[PDB]
Design a protein around this ligand. Structure first.
Ligand code: FMN
Length: 362
């Protein structure tokens, strides 16, 4: 078995390969998009993970697309996240913050000034996001048509990611994960289906990857490359954002470019929750030979699949989403081959302690 053996992940060392995947739970305080003591308890319960990757966290107010998702831009947010990271560290854990801009997967009612969200192009995502009703309960609402970012606004986006990483360092996170997956802003630029720009940020793969690579360079300069990871979902379709007709070639281009920066990790979200075609071993080899840090796989993994691919040398760690939602001590359960708690997906999004901090440890 290798799942329970240590792994150096940039500037930190994980004691096992069983990582907690990022999971939006939509329990922050509004107004202010502030993490809570209940969220600190949730993460503290999971601190035996080789690495915790937090729920997606806004880099700015404009980045917000879901009511209840936290930010890392305000002083009050920074102060609250400092308590959460302290709690994880008190339990000898490690925690990374996943940073996002939702782009067009958003709604005007939670944007600054009530105005349209932004994206690469002015095309509706044709999906829903999650708002809150007058009693604070999560509700699904159609996304608002976005405005295309003007060329002169793109430096501000890069600066927002830079500043959020600086804030993550102060807040005590061990690493950052850039959310370049799942149809959110960075992926909106990457994908030909959502990016119809005719400037240097659209067209060719080199132009479509331009923004994400500018963000990577900015955050590496702000902190250090050994503190930066990135989540990608480059094969398949995710929240109506496909990866285009040359998805494999384009993914390998992006990975080769990320490798030049010497970042800590590459986290690949292999399928969305509705499924998709599995990665071939050949494609995993092509990824492996292009990236020289840690590769994290995710998407309906079992311990068996993780051990298989780690032992084949194709990935270094596995991130579990829903199993970690329901099992705070997943590491111990997997080590002892114990049963897992049953999942309650009706409480994944919104609400309070129920379905959040009340899944028992062994
Ligand atoms: C309730 C829920 C919230 C999620 N939120 C995020 C998120 O904030 N960021 C992200 O990159 N993926 C998110 N995901 C995807 C998970 O990280 C993970 O890739 C996915 O659950 C598939 O893995 P699993 O079969 O182990 O659950 C979420 C999934 C679920 C079920």
């Amino acid at each position: 078995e290798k799942l329970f053996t240590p792994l150096k992940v940039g500037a930190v060392t994980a004691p096992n390969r069983v990582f907690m995947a990022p999971a939006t739970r939509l329990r922050s305080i509004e107004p202010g998009d502030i993490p809570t003591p209940l969220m600190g308890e949730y993460y503290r319960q999971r601190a035996s993970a080789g690495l915790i990757i937090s729920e997606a966290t806004q880099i700015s107010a404009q980045a917000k697309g879901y009511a209840g998702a936290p930010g890392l831009h305000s002083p009050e947010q920074i102060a609250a996240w400092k308590k959460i990271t302290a709690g994880v560290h008190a339990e000898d854990g490690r925690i990374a913050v996943q940073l996002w801009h939702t782009g067009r997967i958003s709604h005007s009612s939670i944007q600054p000034g009530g105005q349209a969200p932004v994206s690469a192009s002015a095309l509706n995502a044709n999906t829903r996001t999650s708002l809150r009703d007058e009693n604070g309960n999560a509700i699904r609402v159609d996304t608002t048509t976005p405005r295309a970012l003007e060329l002169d606004e793109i430096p501000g986006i890069v600066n927002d990611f830079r500043q959020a990483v600086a804030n993550a360092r102060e807040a005590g996170f061990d690493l950052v994960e850039l959310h370049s997956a799942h149809g959110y802003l960075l992926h909106q630029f990457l994908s030909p289906s959502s990016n119809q720009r005719t400037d240097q940020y659209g067209g060719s793969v080199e132009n479509r990857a331009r923004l994400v690579l500018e963000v990577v360079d900015a955050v590496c300069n702000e902190w250090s490359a050994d503190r930066i990871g990135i989540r990608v979902s480059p094969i398949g379709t995710f929240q109506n954002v496909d990866n285009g007709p040359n998805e494999e070639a384009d993914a390998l281009y992006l990975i080769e470019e990320l490798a030049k920066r010497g970042i800590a990790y590459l986290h690949m979200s292999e399928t969305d929750l509705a499924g998709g075609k599995p990665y071939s071993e050949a494609f995993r080899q092509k990824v492996r030979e292009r990236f020289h840090g840690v590769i994290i796989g995710a998407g309906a993994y079992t311990a068996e699949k993780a051990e298989d691919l780690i032992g084949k040398g194709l990935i270094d760690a596995v991130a579990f989403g829903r199993d970690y939602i329901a099992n705070p001590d997943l590491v111990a359960r997997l080590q002892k081959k114990a049963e897992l708690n049953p999942q309650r997906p009706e409480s994944f999004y919104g609400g309070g302690a129920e379905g959040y901090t009340d899944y028992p440890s062994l």
